[PDB]
Design a protein around this ligand. Sequence first.
Ligand SMILES: O=C(Cc1ccc(-c2n[nH]c(=O)c3ccccc23)cc1)N1CCc2ccccc21
Length: 384
Amino acid sequence: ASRQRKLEALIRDPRSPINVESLLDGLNSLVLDLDFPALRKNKNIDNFLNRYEKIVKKIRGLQMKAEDYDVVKVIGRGAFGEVQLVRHKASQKVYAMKLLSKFEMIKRAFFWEERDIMAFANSPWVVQLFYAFQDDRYLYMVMEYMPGGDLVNLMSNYDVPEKWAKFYTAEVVLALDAIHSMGLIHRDVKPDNMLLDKHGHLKLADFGTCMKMDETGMVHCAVGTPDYISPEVLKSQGDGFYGRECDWWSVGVFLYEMLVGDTPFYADSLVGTYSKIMDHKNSLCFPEDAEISKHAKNLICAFLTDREVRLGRNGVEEIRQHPFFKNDQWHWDNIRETAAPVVPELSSDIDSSNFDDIEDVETFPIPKAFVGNQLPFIGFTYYR
Ligand SMILES: O=C(Cc1ccc(-c2n[nH]c(=O)c3ccccc23)cc1)N1CCc2ccccc21
């Protein structure tokens, strides 16, 4: 009973590898991976499935499921799956729910490690995870809805003045400081990941790229669209190592797209984008027509240089000290409680005006032998 108290404690700890959610995930996966007629020929499998069939159904009904949510509309669709604006039926609260195809996911081990670190850190600069669940086909992630839309949408609807770019860059800078302080490297900082909350304040979202830094403060191994990716990250794709400074390159790309209107290494092809990024010493140029302050040009260039000499290599203090961030509207300690330059007008809690309309799927193939397709997702379920 003393050893049983110690064992009953690990299972109660929600941050434990084997806990109630993990144990339930294990039993659900075991039932799913064995419920195939070819496998059912084995008496051990058929009998286990018979005993636990009814109870696994009862348990699946009590646990959080997709049916507990009302699908308002799709606000993003991709290769992975979609993002739905949903409302929890019982609490009546609106959330953003990403659906990941388990099948597509498997074609890419413990990938939610960084999601858990970020979820626990609970930074006001990072889009919050409330719950995560799963069914045979999908992985579900219930996130805080960011009704202000992303910075792709803001950029395509506004001509961004230096007062505005000075604010979003500072918020991205504090969000990246937060992520690095968790022992993480975002890896794919771009305006699709820059989401705006109910008041127009920025938060960084991780769409599966965040990685835990090793003892040396480095990562490895994905890119997708490269406009915001540093040369070191491109060159690593390979098993190459890079640090947190790869995220500061994306801040420079961001400041450029805000003030200029186009990405600094844009091209009609992906190859050309990749090339212009690698030859960034010759290809970086500001248009004559685009009027940009000396400090703005300076800051973009301090970030868009080789990792060795890039701004942020010494720390965040030199980025904050940069004269571009001299202003009469905010401080580095109070920026999030100051007036945001673009305040959203939201008539209802399901107002999705800042999101482009989408409106309107492959699965695992039935196995002959046990293959354990559900095994990699044991522990994904998150409840707090
Ligand atoms: O993608 C996500 C987590 C996430 C984070 C924010 C949002 C999100 N949140 N809020 C909004 O309003 C919104 C509007 C459009 C689009 C998205 C949103 C949705 C999912 N992860 C995290 C772990 C992981 C592994 C593998 C693959 C993916 C992901």
